[PDB]
Design a protein around this ligand. Structure first.
Ligand code: HEM
Ligand code: HS0
Length: 370
């Protein structure tokens, strides 16, 4: 997978993110690295105000611009959401909202934190000679002490890596189909299935490393955005950049390129529908890189691997391809069992509309089994 920026190890995730910035930018990174101690102690929406309009010009290699977008990113979430209890800033200062929106529009992205910012870039290996697990990794950044953003981004990150096992497989699937190689292809769809059958046991650590209460009450509030949120019905001013408030999505895994690519591949049309479910995940393609866009693009340009299985009436492929769509339902049936532990049960101590979405989606998967 050429200039699609796909790692043959961590896939869509960014490989060995930058842990540190240039020195030209050290009063960014000092906020960013003491956001709990500072939000709490109130001087954060006093310390932010008192900064000056830096310029992107210095940021050279990728990882820099990216980590830079992470840093600006969460600082915006602390400034806007405050202590995370309802005193909401509807104005992002001239001075923080101009290098953030340049650094963003440099990377064809929107000025707000995303999936690729705070799961795909926000990580480091504790020892860069052992392997990528929970016990040998740590996040760069967090919002408040005891929010578990270790558990969230790390577990969430770990999975996207278990799907990468199957991304290096896509190249060979369509090869088999073209050169017509019934055998070769049946394999690729079983490897592809084999991975997501495992990216499930990944998901299980969530229960070891996150707390229902902490995720519903703490994290979530800082991840929200200003699109259809009612605390900022009109959006968020971006000072000396848009005199008009600008709505933007919260941060969702609806911005992840794996899953979205495996629906593309497996002929499951989650984008097509006009329904709320499918309108969203199309408008989240925006909140994804460009290079991870143009890969879901070149997939959808590909001949439906579903059709080519239906035809052949070859109960082998018929079965192997169902293994992949069995795999994907399996996972979103878990991802609903977590959401009831981690958003519904606590909310009883917006709501539903979230689960309908997540079911609307489990379903459209199912209805592609042969
Ligand atoms: C406590 C943990 C989690 C909670 C509360 C949660 C909740 C949600 C919610 C409410 C949505 C709907 C979009 C939104 O409202 O933002 C969503 C979408 C999504 N989540 Fe999760 N999730 C969790 C863990 C994970 C993990 C570990 C993964 C994968 C690594 C994941 C992958 C996704 C994906 C891919 C979507 C969008 C695709 C779709 O709609 O099927 N989530 N999640
Ligand atoms: N809303 C979300 C934000 C982030 Br980052 C990751 C996620 N996983 N599942 C949901 C969700």
């Amino acid at each position: 997978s050429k200039e699609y920026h796909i790692d043959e190890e961590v896939g869509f995730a960014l490989p060995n993110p930058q842990e540190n910035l240039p020195d030209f930018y050290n009063d960014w990174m000092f906020i960013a690295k003491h956001l709990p101690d500072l939000i709490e102690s109130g001087q954060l929406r006093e310390r932010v105000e008192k900064l000056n309009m830096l310029s992107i010009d210095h940021l050279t290699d990728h990882k820099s611009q990216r980590l830079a977008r992470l840093v600006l990113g969460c600082i915006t979430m602390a400034y806007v959401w405050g202590k995370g209890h309802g005193d909401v800033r509807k104005v992002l200062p001239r001075n923080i909202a101009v290098p953030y929106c340049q650094l963003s529009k440099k990377l064809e992205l929107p000025p707000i934190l995303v999936y690729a910012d705070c799961v795909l870039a926000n990580w480091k290996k504790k020892d860069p000679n052992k392997p990528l697990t929970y016990e040998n990794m740590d996040v760069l950044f967090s919002f408040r002490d005891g929010d578990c953003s270790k558990g969230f981004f790390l577990v969430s990150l770990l999975v996207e890596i278990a799907a990468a096992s199957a991304i290096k497989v896509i190249p060979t699937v369509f090869k088999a189909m073209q050169m017509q190689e019934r055998d070769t292809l049946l394999k690729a769809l079983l490897e592809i299935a084999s991975c997501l059958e495992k990216a499930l046991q990944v998901f299980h650590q969530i229960h070891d490393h996150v707390n229902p209460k902490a995720f519903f009450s703490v994290l979530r509030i800082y991840l929200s955005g200003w699109k259809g949120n009612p605390q900022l019905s009109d959006g968020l001013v971006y000072e000396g950049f848009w005199e008009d408030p600008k709505e933007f999505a919260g941060g969702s895994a609806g911005q992840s390129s794996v899953f979205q690519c495996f629906d593309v591949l497996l002929g499951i049309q989650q984008t097509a529908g006009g329904g709320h479910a499918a309108q969203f995940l199309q408008d989240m393609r925006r909140y994804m890189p460009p290079a991870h866009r143009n890969f879901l693009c070149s997939l959808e340009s590909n001949p439906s691997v579903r059709e080519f299985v239906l035809s052949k009436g070859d109960a082998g492929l018929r079965e192997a391809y169902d293994a992949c769509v069995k795999a994907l339902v399996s996972l979103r049936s878990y991802h609903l069992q977590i959401v009831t532990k981690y958003i519904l049960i606590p909310a009883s101590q917006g709501g539903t509309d979230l689960m309908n979405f997540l079911k609307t989606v489990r379903s459209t998967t199912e209805k592609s089994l042969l």
